[PDB]
């Protein structure tokens, strides 16, 4: 993502005017190919009308340019595109909230799984590695940025997310479906094995760990839902005809006609339609935003930084359950005491 | 469903343009019958006006075509259809989230119901088979795709979802209503029977299993609500008059009139109304999407794959509580240790 | 309600066209009285203009018909009605979800309240009868269909929902307010009395029963909120002026004027305004839907079937805690065993 | 509030027509002062134009009346007011749901805090009086109807909500902020003192009481949020200019001009603009609803009855924990037994 | 924020009219710089047209002023700005609800962590200081008003939020990411250390404290999400072109043209466009509100008072766990006893 929240904290004059000079994650990078096609297709039809057509054939073009100008308003562009951008944005923030974070499990494994010896130290690191693995295996199913980092399961073993003894157990489990649910079952069987050896004290503390596992399992199930149940293809096909047929009609209808013929409306020749090129900037602008946010786990400039977030969650989890288990600072009287 | 999320991860040029060449789950398959009726009804009236009507009778058609062109805008098509598509889409994603998943019960039965012998192995499989049966019995009430797979309760016994001793107990329970709540009561009575025999250790662990049963019972109750409390029939009848009466008026009003009579607006004859056939493509396009998504448990190309999801949930549940009970991989020091 | 979900599972041709031939719960039953008043008021003014007014007085009517046609568009009908139908529909589904269901309490009372003797059998039936009574007493406050079934509290005793010893205790409790909260306090005092006699085993199992009581108490509190805090009367009065003053102006403005006077727009006489009668069908159509759904607990054809649902909840509750307490089917090896 | 839900249960003919004859809580009471100013300002300008201006000065008024009629449509009244009424209504129902109800705490204190002697009777009444006091102290901060009933804290002691020994402890606690959180801390310290004396049996039953305290603490925190974080003043100032500048332009632009001058549009003189006075009825109608619902805790006719609800919650709470502690009706076989 | 909720409790006449005379947090302070640029750019073009252009060059300006007046309506200002203000407002209230409050942890630490001696007094103050520190460290990442108060971590030690022994432990923990999660791990390790020393009685009471820690950890994670995942920059760049290009066209198109040339529409010269300056007041008015609310943690007049709220939460937390631990008022019979 491109974060600019620190720049728009106040509102003085050029609050948004300094943001339209930025290239990365901008409207100017998204529309740059579709704009130059629309400019070149416009100026081709303009130069053919002004140089190539004969006098008996220019008048045939003038009748089509007035027909296509009057009846292109029958294409309900704002109705069709306005409904579609509401679907993409409603699903956009709902998929950020479905990204699992280890920090609620991390608080409970760091304190309730006892032991400063090398076995309880191994037992807390394996729990938080199973919680991170249950999240990597769903992100490499829903994100093309995570999948290009981990193309095969051998790449997951090389990153330290999975030991080689766990890869043999992960392949011997024969299932034709997606196996992202495997480490979330290894977690709950290891947390019960930890209790039966005396590492977790009570069953109220065990069930509190198992409740945060199922919360993270529900987070992974939502990411599986938004990847599998797409926006309906019948909606995507309607909105790409509504935008493209509207500006296909604007290549004919928005031509500057001959002022000597004195048509109503076409009384001035300027050679560049500024208000048509602006109207392409907004109608095809919102279509290109919807193309970007329909899958926010790709490799756009403003998609979600999921390769970053895997690196954060692995380092923070194994820091809080290993280096921060009973390492507390000394209890001290603060500034306000009596 | 037709999933295309992997194809629209980035936004380069033809992000949505490559999706309008696909036939399965498309707008071209839905509108194919209504479009050819509207084309043929249009060209019939056009050829009757141009070949059959006399000169004193064409002028009567010209007056009706101008009346029906001016006052067909009194039909509030975008207001009526825009409200209706908001209802169908708001209920659409809310019914996907009501589909029950076994995976939260599956995590707790796989670890808390003890025993590696043949009785505790039988006890965990029967719990997860009652959770899957409490979901099949509501899906064959709300889905016509599941009902055509399981037309009678004898088909459920042949699929292994119900033993023949449970079908006798399911028929002896005399109730005139829907019996989808029966296996969710058998679950809670078997989980308490499991605790009283020592298989479940504490009552905190029993109540954690019973809380995930009632969460899955609330999921089945939402699917019962959306099937029984439909979108009101008075809304469905208004929107199918608003779309059909609008394009019934466009069979007369959008005719190409005689250019020799020099009417305002009808100065060009093209024999094919491109902007009327496009306007049918969007207004009757959104009506056909709403016809598809009003019951997303049918047999459309973009309805929910519920026969697939029953086969997934049965195989994954009986895998995690039978083959994955205490089968953990060996605890190993990972890549980051010291 | 009128359920048609089984008929619109697929979308072939006449998916919604077969639904506009149905009378029960239709737009044709709601608008039948307001339409015939609007037709008869229109044709009265039309026949008075064509037969009764003199030539010097018809020209006074022609000036008012052109004034009322041009400036009736100042009435913001779609803005006022479009906001109001959003309020009625947003509250409509939120009141279905507030209807309490016994099935989460029913799962926990059927398993955790022990005893096969006649006292534990009496103790489970009294708990589930207090949960159903705490729901009947709020439905007969919010529904006129339940109130006409149970006009007095003596009718509740005759239906078996309340024993005569409980009616004496229900009247001796002196409170000037609504007493729907009485059986939800009798539930929690009987569940603690059940634990202190050894019928409920632990306090974790007691608190799980008491948590589902307070969830059902929160359901009854939402039904009390939507009945008491109505849609504001100032909104209901504005929308019934916006629809009725608009079509009061259409009785004058949509008259067919004299074609011999050659007014702009009134060049054709057809004696029946098809696009005005259609415009009454949608603007007064959505007003009549909002009149139906503003209280979905009445006796309309598409209001909620609450007398049915009380009969379901009483039979299902006393079936699962009496006939299904420890009556489990025999544990059997299923089809997939080895 | 003005409740009319019992009157609109069905939809026959005059479902909403009988509601426009009611004065209390109506649009006719809200707009009565702004309407008579707008009528009198209109008829003053009309009588000055028809009686006072000279013939060379009436023509200057005719040019301004045509300028102000054409360009008053540049004021986006429906866009500005339609966004603002969505904010007021979205916050309106969310503040009713934030009003705390004692009935979930009331169910648990009435059963789990043991003792029929005068000390356990005193202990249950003090808990439910602290829960009601933690709600009165936030309602007299957010409601002007509760504050005029309890202007000082001495008025709270006179109503029985606070004993005089608790007022000394409430003043000795020195805090410069709002002290609505004080009785919610006294509750949790008294519930633990009740457990340490043996009145509450287990810690699972103690934590269930403390969880419903924090739910009621979260309800009071939401009422503190909506009172402190208002709708932004920049929104309130824009919408009161958009409505008032629009009808300031309608005092000039909607005048009936001279028919002898034959302006386009002003061909009929009627002396009363019915469609301008109706347009004031809806645009300034929705502004006056938003003025009423922006603080629903005031003293309007359709604000929330919070003085009523305090009197209900105090009587119902002290009834269920004192007169209904172990007072159960006799267990009896119901109508359906064998 | 600017609170005016106490002033709009009722709705009499000048309910909103008395609020448009206020300067702080007003539309007049936000638009004051952009308005004077738009006025001065308008009157410069007006005085150049009336004094500097020649007669053959004024007619060239008249043709551009009619072109830019007719086709500036192609810029979809209400569609582009209306979608953007819905995003800013939807995120606005969702970030107020993400601000963490200590009061649910404060209720449970004040009662369940035993001890009146100087060690249990030190133990409760350190828990509530870790909960407040876990909130300050995320607010100084998301707010520029908190960051200017605490620029470095040495400023946090000087305010009493962190003892100097905790700053050494906070720096020795080597992490390249944001460290707001550190005190929320110190909390859970100190609450378990408190239980193992006998200060917290049971594990049900420990897990209740740890559940409110993870609720406050989820609040801090939402504030991290809204700061990091901004509104997409491609949306911010489109709306600042849609507003600025529209009123760049209104500097030419809304000029008062020559009345002697008798153009359609430009028949009156008034030298001040009142309805253009009003149209700038609303379209650029809503843009400046969106500039203010896109980061509500800055230093605007109507941003969130977060430096105030830190001072409240620190004083209230250390008051309820130190001065209010077992300091209860005397149990007294209230006004309603027999
Ligand atoms: Ca993307
Ligand atoms: Ca379907
Ligand atoms: Ca009704
Ligand atoms: Ca008010
Ligand atoms: Ca700001």
Author numbering:
A (entry chain B), B (entry chain A), C (entry chain E), D (entry chain D), E (entry chain C): 2 to 339
Quote the study's own text.
The channel comprises five BEST1 subunits arranged symmetrically around a central ion pore that is ~95 Å long.
We find that the W287F mutation (BEST1345 W287F) produces channels with dramatically altered gating. Approximately, 80% of the Cl- current level through BEST1345 W287F is maintained when Ca2+ was chelated with EGTA, whereas currents through wild type BEST1 drop to zero. To understand the molecular basis of this behavior, we determined cryo-EM structures of BEST1345 W287F in the presence and absence of Ca2+ at 2.7 Å and 3.0 Å resolutions, respectively. Unlike BEST1345, 3D classification of the BEST1345 W287F dataset did not reveal a closed conformation, which indicates that essentially all of the particles are in an open conformation and that the open state is preferential for this mutant. Thus, in accord with the electrophysiological recordings, the W287F mutation decouples Ca2+ binding from the conformational changes in the neck that are observed for the wild type channel. Modeling of the W287F mutation on a closed conformation of the channel introduces a void behind the neck, which we hypothesize energetically disfavors the closed conformation.
